[PDB]
Ligand binder design. Structure first.
Ligand SMILES: NC(=O)c1ccc[n+]([C@@H]2O[C@H](COP(=O)([O-])OP(=O)(O)OC[C@H]3O[C@@H](n4cnc5c(N)ncnc54)[C@H](OP(=O)(O)O)[C@@H]3O)[C@@H](O)[C@H]2O)c1
Ligand SMILES: NC(=O)c1ccc[n+]([C@@H]2O[C@H](COP(=O)([O-])OP(=O)(O)OC[C@H]3O[C@@H](n4cnc5c(N)ncnc54)[C@H](OP(=O)(O)O)[C@@H]3O)[C@@H](O)[C@H]2O)c1
Lengths: 495, 495
């Protein structure tokens, strides 16, 4: 049956004591990396039972667009613990990422990506003591993939950041820092540009920080953060950032200690945990028996510790590290593909080293920590007052700014709305600015309410119908104020 | 008077042959870096006339929210050439970036950020021959700053990518490659997740590439790209990417050769050119005469060559390089702020070296190239057919998915629309998926047209008014098909 440990984690413990997990082979190199891992697990006599289910490209090919079949959802709800190989996501077309789907379907909001130097895995940073962890928000931001072609030639993607999601991820980061003996957490954002969206993470970071006076909270702008991560990565311990930023920074850090073949990760939520490598399906290596399975193996190790199977975790992790320390069986990504050991040979070596322990690089098994509960989360605040002050109407037209401006002022005449300004790609173009801005066939037209109280729905739709009598609109955004503060930004160049 | 050179570039040439430029001191370290640069210029007898104007924080403090005063716009329209120090943008609140405003006001669509190893500027990558250039799209994507609080606790930023802007940036990259003798261009995108937005750059890249058979065009996913830039940066020559991706990758590359103190840049457009360092106003070093002015100096050098003042550019750049080669006067970012030379001393040393022989005469290899014209650009295609097939209605509510679904189906009864599904943060929650997705108070409700032809505006507004009779909507998106293909995506978990 499924049980809840004292740490609050959910896991399926079989009568014989073994823990049942869902295993997803994946696409490309996936199966090879997972196959290798399962062999090492069995050799180490890991107390596990396996429910193999599919996800990714193989499922897209069955005509299931989400790439996550019902049997796999059923299995994950049964086990609450998953070890998956990479899943292939078509580039530029096709189905949405099944990797993102798994995380969002099961609220595994935290993506933990630790990086450390490895024995006989040389990098220009060897000896600097790089030991940091990137805590990537895992379920919102841009990667949700909510897109709409505003016009035939203008595409739009929504970036959504919530207080709820930001509060969760920053709290997780602090708890993680406090659980690994780290006394500092960096929050990387682009809040100087996205004051509302990225600023939500910055503000959640600052408010939750007050509860962890034992940890130093430092905010850093994401670009300078990338620069610092390359120039002096040893200054970082824990870095928490939004989904997209985290995707790039975590891959940046992996290149500091050997590459993606050595980057494991854990997708953690309160109800489910998904362990997988940070790397992809890597189609050019699939089936060639040359791929490095270290990343997936180390992920299984993270899974073992999560499962409280610390002994097996140390055993497997020691074997791997011992194998690296000796430096006799190294994969192509470390010694070139003209010399690199085969995947199966690498596996066999590690297995042959089960029971052996490295002298230098050893297992740094931190202490488990209870995940923050919803009842202790900082709930979003309900404004004391709020009002709809206008509406942004997006239109598709090639009419020049000045003419569009006069046309809309005429259409709004008689309504309780006035055209305040018009922007193109976010740049004010009406009133004119004296600039030389090039224009696309998409314009955002800001109308402000001029009456008493607030703009009511009927009035807004009436304004939109008037605009529609001549122009094609495709996107509407209400402009609201919450506690006297506008819940929207000005255009670039707008005074 | 303002003239057009035989290369297409516009510059203000005075009666005496001097080229008039607009100079913006900036904020924080800005003034110090600019001040120094001007000193070196005057010493090198650069044939320039300066029109000093302000932008940035000092202007925000005058109550001009755009941070770009009219006199500065007037000056830029007059000179078409600008040398600016960094500008401070408030973090998480306040005014929008004046740096982004200048670029968008004057359509300086390409941000060229060259990176190379410098003498006596130690990095773990020294000797690997890193010599690449990031071509960052400069006027669209997320950095436009178009934001709306969908609900009091859910923020939204629009990511807009146009065919026009993407076509221009990739063509620029190819021309730049062909002009610097580079035989390869990498296009980094996240097209696997954002098939419409990021995919626009990918598709523009591939179609424009057909015009440059002499150049090898390679697409790479942005995350793997960061990994590769850290693991093996010497493989890259030219990298072209969207605005935000480029912001991060360019700073990542700067940390490979000395840090932001050595990263110059050029904001290029057809009508205007703005030269500035990649770094910011760096408030903690402001006024302490310790900041490294190299980045701004080299930007002035890029400016000089733009102005066709090649002799002065070589003179100044050789002096700088000679100074670094001698390694007698190095700034704090190179040898530590405990032994680093003062900004004024570093400057003095360079001026003293005006005329020396840099042993490794690595005056960068550059060849002027004509900017692509609009008449030669691939225009966006006008669909043969198009139709509105539905509407996405975003509502603010905490009513559970199941009940929200039933409520909306009831409201749509009688209309030529049906509720297809409902998502939360991009994840399908209605119909139920069997997942354990956490919900925020923002839901996207997809309605599909069920009649013949297409959904007309009056019918759409009628549906919205019915939804409004019970729920608060704040965001509408029409769903359109162009040439038989949906101009929108499915939700995560939606089959
Ligand atoms: N969580 C996931 O399941 C996940 C994460 C990322 C990408 N993907 C998917 O993967 C497909 C390919 O994407 P991609 O080519 O950009 O990236 P990728 O699969 O991570 O491959 C990029 C490069 O990383 C190196 N690498 C990755 N895994 C390695 C391993 N196990 N051992 C040794 N080297 C390894 C290789 O470098 P060299 O080429 O330099 O040898 C490789 O070509 C897509 O559909 C993508 O969406 C899935
Ligand atoms: N184009 C622009 O005008 C521009 C570009 C970026 C940021 N900004 C603005 O700048 C303000 C501060 O932002 P930030 O602190 O994130 O970044 P930043 O000003 O670039 O400073 C980050 C770090 O870069 C190093 N650095 C930058 N310029 C340097 C130079 N000339 N010489 C030596 N080292 C240098 C320093 O590293 P250490 O601390 O390690 O010494 C510095 O603290 C904000 O308002 C931001 O929006 C403006």
């Amino acid at each position: 049956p499924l049980i809840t440990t004292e740490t609050g984690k959910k896991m399926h413990v079989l009568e014989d004591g073994r823990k049942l997990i869902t295993v997803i082979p994946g696409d490309g190199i996936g199966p090879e990396c997972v196959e290798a891992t399962l062999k090492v697990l069995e050799a180490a006599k890991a107390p596990l039972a396996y429910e193999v289910r599919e996800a990714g490209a193989s499922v897209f090919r069955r005509g299931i667009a989400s790439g996550v079949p019902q049997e796999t959802i059923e299995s994950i709800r049964k086990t609450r613990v998953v070890l998956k190989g990479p899943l292939e996501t078509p580039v530029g077309y096709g189905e949405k990422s099944a990797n993102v789907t798994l995380r969002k379907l099961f609220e595994t909001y935290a993506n933990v990506r630790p990086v450390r130097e490895f024995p006989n895995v040389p990098t220009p940073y060897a000896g600097r003591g790089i030991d940091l962890v990137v805590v990537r928000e895992n379920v919102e931001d841009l990667y949700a993939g909510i897109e709409h072609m505003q016009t035939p030639s203008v595409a739009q993607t929504l970036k959504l950041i919530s207080w709820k999601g930001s509060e969760k991820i920053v709290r997780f980061a602090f708890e993680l820092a406090r659980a690994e003996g780290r006394k500092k957490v960096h929050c990387a954002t682009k809040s100087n540009i996205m004051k509302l969206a990225e600023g939500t993470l910055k503000r959640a970071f600052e408010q939750v920080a007050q509860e962890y006076p034992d940890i130093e909270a430092v905010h850093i702008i994401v670009d300078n953060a990338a620069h610092q991560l390359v120039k002096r990565p040893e200054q970082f311990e824990v870095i928490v950032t939004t989904n997209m930023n985290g995707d790039i920074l975590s891959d940046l850090t992996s290149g500091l200690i050997g590459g993606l073949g050595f980057a494991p990760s854990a997708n953690i939520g309160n109800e489910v945990a998904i362990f997988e490598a940070v790397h992809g399906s890597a189609p050019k290596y699939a089936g060639k028996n040359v791929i490095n399975p270290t990343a997936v193996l180390l992920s299984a190790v993270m899974m073992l510790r999560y499962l409280e199977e610390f002994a097996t975790a140390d055993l497997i992790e020691n074997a791997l590290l011992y194998t690296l320390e000796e430096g006799r069986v190294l994969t192509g990504d470390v010694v070139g593909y003209d010399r690199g050991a085969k995947t199966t040979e690498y596996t066999e070596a590690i297995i042959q080293n089960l029971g052996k322990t490295p002298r230098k690089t050893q297992v740094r098994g931190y202490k488990p920590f209870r995940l923050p509960q919803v009842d202790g989360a900082i709930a979003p605040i309900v404004p004391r007052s709020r009002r709809v002050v206008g509406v942004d109407v997006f239109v598709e037209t090639n009419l020049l700014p000045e003419a569009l401006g006069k046309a809309l002022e005429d259409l709004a005449a008689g309504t309780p709305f006035r055209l305040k300004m018009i922007s193109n790609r976010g740049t004010q173009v009406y009133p004119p600015t004296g600039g030389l801005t090039d224009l696309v066939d998409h314009y955002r037209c800001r109308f402000l309410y001029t009456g008493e109280g607030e703009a009511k729905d009927p009035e807004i739709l009436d304004l939109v119908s008037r605009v529609a009598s001549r122009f094609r609109w495709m996107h509407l955004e209400k402009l609201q104020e919450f506690d006297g503060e506008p819940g929207f930004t000005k255009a670039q160049g707008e005074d």
